[PDB]
Amino acid sequence: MQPWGRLLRLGAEEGEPHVLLRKREWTIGRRRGCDLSFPSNKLVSGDHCRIVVDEKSGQVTLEDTSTSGTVINKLKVVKKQTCPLQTGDVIYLVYRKNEPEHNVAYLYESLSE
Amino acid sequence: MQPWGRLLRLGAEEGEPHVLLRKREWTIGRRRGCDLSFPSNKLVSGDHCRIVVDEKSGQVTLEDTSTSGTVINKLKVVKKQTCPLQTGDVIYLVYRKNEPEHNVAYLYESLSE
Structure with a gap:
């Protein structure tokens, strides 16, 4: 197979x-047989998560199979729907991949936790 | 009401x-009656999005009602489930809010688009 990611x-x-x-x-974990393993890290499960590529659509997906879970930094596009907010999130009212000068963004912070 | 966010x-x-x-x-848009408006910005819809706080659970939510949509930077916790991946995302196999020195992270990049 040809390289789809890295x-x-x-x-x-x-x-x-x-x-x-x-x-x-692609498997990641503490166990020896994982494609990417960290044998001495106890904060990592034996089989922590796997990254898979959809053969036809090309959609890449991560599946967590761990005790703790896996954290991902994403740039979620919300269009005519809902999405939860959390302290530390950043909201882009205007987001231009080619004209970043036009970006209009605000950091959101909760006044509780 | 007491300040819940900013x-x-x-x-x-x-x-x-x-x-x-x-x-x-809280309403955001180009129109005059919005709590936060940008009257001269054409890349912003008249009624772009609204931020709402759940009275009982305290869950804050953003709802997009625009033509283009709204982009949010989040730190999604994936536990025993699925989540799509996209070029530019960052994966944290280990994430410690109090011991950031223990963070184990990898930037993911697609070899297509």
Whole structure:
């Protein structure tokens, strides 16, 4: 299969090693048989999560199979629907991928927790 | 009602003005009657989105009622379920609010689009 994605350790430069995702079901965990494992990290489950690519649509999905869970930083597009808000979130009333100068954004913070 | 939240323009210091959310249904748009309006911005709908607070549970929600839509930066916790992935997302295998030194994270990037 041809390379559909990759992982880079947060904060790494370009001259740093990256992880090539060349399968359909990439496993991550503490166990030895995982494609990406961390044998000495107890905060990571034996089978923590897997990243899968849809053969036809090309949609990539992550499935958590752990005790703790997995956290993802996303840029959710809300169109004519609902979405929960949480302290620390940032709301973009205007978001232009090609004209970032036009971005209009506000950080949301709760006055409780 | 007592202040449940607030908005701060992205990048502002602490000495900058913020928006106090003291209602139940805060409206944002281009129209004049919106609680927060941008009369001269054509990339913003007359009634773009509203932020609402659940009286009992305290859950805050944003509802988009626009032509374009609204973008939100979130930190989604995935536990024993599914979640779509997209270029630019960051995956935290380990995420400790109090011990950030233990964070284990990887930036995900697609090799297509």
